[PDB]
Amino acid sequence: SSRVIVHVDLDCFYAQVEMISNPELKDKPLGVQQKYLVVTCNYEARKLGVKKLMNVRDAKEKCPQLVLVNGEDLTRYREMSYKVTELLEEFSPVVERLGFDENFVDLTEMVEKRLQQLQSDELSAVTVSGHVYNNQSINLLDVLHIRLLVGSQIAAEMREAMYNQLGLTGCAGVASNKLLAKLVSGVFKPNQQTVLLPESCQHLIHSLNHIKEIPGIGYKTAKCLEALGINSVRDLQTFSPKILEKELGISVAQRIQKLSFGEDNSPVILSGPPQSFSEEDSFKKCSSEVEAKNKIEELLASLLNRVCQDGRKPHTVRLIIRRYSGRESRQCPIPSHVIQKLGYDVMTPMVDILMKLFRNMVNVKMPFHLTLLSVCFCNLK
DNA sequence: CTGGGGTCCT
DNA sequence: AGGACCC
Ligand SMILES: Nc1ccn([C@H]2C[C@H](O)[C@@H](COP(=O)(O)NP(=O)(O)OP(=O)(O)O)O2)c(=O)n1
Ligand SMILES: [Mg+2]
Ligand SMILES: [Mg+2]
Ligand SMILES: [Mg+2]
Numbered sequence: 001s002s003r004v005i006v007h008v009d010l011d012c013f014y015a016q017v018e019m020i021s022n023p024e025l026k027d028k029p030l031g032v033q034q035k036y037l038v039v040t041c042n043y044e045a046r047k048l049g050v051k052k053l054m055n056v057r058d059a060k061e062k063c064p065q066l067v068l069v070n071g072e073d074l075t076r077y078r079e080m081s082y083k084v085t086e087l088l089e090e091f092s093p094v095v096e097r098l099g100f101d102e103n104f105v106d107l108t109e110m111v112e113k114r115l116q117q118l119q120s121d122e123l124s125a126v127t128v129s130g131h132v133y134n135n136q137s138i139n140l141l142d143v144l145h146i147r148l149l150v151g152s153q154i155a156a157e158m159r160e161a162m163y164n165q166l167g168l169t170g171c172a173g174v175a176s177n178k179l180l181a182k183l184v185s186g187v188f189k190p191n192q193q194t195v196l197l198p199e200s201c202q203h204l205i206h207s208l209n210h211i212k213e214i215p216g217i218g219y220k221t222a223k224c225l226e227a228l229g230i231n232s233v234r235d236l237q238t239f240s241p242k243i244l245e246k247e248l249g250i251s252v253a254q255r256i257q258k259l260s261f262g263e264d265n266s267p268v269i270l271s272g273p274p275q276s277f278s279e280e281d282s283f284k285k286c287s288s289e290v291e292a293k294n295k296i297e298e299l300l301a302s303l304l305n306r307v308c309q310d311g312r313k314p315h316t317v318r319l320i321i322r323r324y325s326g327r328e329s330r331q332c333p334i335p336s337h338v339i340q341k342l343g344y345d346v347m348t349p350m351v352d353i354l355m356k357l358f359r360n361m362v363n364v365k366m367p368f369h370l371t372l373l374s375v376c377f378c379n380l381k
Numbered sequence: 382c383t384g385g386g387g388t389c390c391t
Numbered sequence: 392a393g394g395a396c397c398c
Pocket of ligand 3: 009010011012013101
């Protein structure tokens with residue numbers, strides 16, 4: 001029943017890709033910018049006070065010498081992401097992606113086969129690779145300790161393969177479920193790894209200072225729980241199941257309370273190929289239907305390239321907008337003939353479709369403006 | 382001065 | 392179609 005899970009999280013991912021592209025920025029403090037957001041920075045810049053998701057005014061005010069590179073085109077980051085995932089898939093085929101830079105791998109079967117090859121004189125020689133969370137003592141006679149140590153070794157081999165084959169560094173966490181692996185992977189950063197033995201689970205879980213630090217408890221749930229007087233992990237652990245179900249529904253309640261105990265039975269799922277391909281473009285102002293139409297042509301060209309490279313075809317298209325004060329969208333199926341002709345002028349029909357979808361949302365006869373235009377291709381087969 | 386992506390559930 | 396969550 002007991003699993004060995006690894007979580008891998010790349011060091012300052014976008015920035016790391018930019019530093020590999022141009023080594024002139026290797027030792028300069030570097031931030032990757034998307035409009036007015038420094039979505040990440042390398043660690044040199046973190047030493048001078050730059051933080052992830054700072055806006056660029058605060059970034060340059062805390063660090064006026066910060067070199068900034070534009071990261072609004074995700075192409076290189078995306079390619080690198082899938083190179084990491086495929087490398088990990090070589091170890092065990094079932095790899096779950098989370099964002100562009102995190103991967104879960106279930107090492108249970110691998111650990112088992114490694115232990116079955118070992119002979120009883122060297123079950124005593126098993127050693128950890130990397131950090132043991134909270135300096136907990138290893139008990140070599142504890143089978144769970146043994147298999148988590150093997151997991152730490154596989155994790156080290158994974159990170160070394162990532163470095164030697166792709167030039168990327170990152171952190172790994174080995175634990176008995178996805179939640180604990182992801183929580184322990186960030187304990188020693190950057191480019192380090194930690195293993196969590198079971199006796200320390202509670203310690204790990206109570207090291208958190210607010211519930212929103214738990215993956216699965218987002219902005220809305222956190223705000224609700226705060227309204228309920230729940231602020232610590234122990235608050236949520238000890239809170240009434242009934243009341244919590246009443247305000248969050250049965251699903252959210254049971255899941256996040258189990259999570260607050262460090263319990264997580266969810267399996268590592270094979271991510272495989274993406275379920276969708278989208279591109280966004282935000283701006284201060286779009287009020288011309290001709291302008292929006294040009295934006296939409298542009299997003300669509302790149303999207304066509306990408307979907308054609310995949311080698312499977314989308315069967316639904318969606319357009320998304322944002323009005324100046326949430327988001328709104330309209331989708332529709334992609335006609336069969338246009339679908340058959342992907343990768344012929346697919347562009348003009350797709351444009352007409354997307355523009356009709358556009359006018360369904362926005363009244364051209366009245367005046368408007370828009371702050372975000374996005375196109376998504378989903379329902380791939 | 383709040384990007385640009387993704388997942389699954391309702 | 393929207394909402395919640397993840398990075
Ligand atoms: N809200 C977010 C979060 C992440 N990202 C991108 C930029 C990051 O380089 C990348 C990886 O996410 P991340 O791991 O949270 N941050 P990053 O890897 O840069 O730093 P560390 O993981 O080293 O702390 O996703 C984004 O564009 N918008
Ligand atoms: Mg990450
Ligand atoms: Mg990272
Ligand atoms: Mg959270």
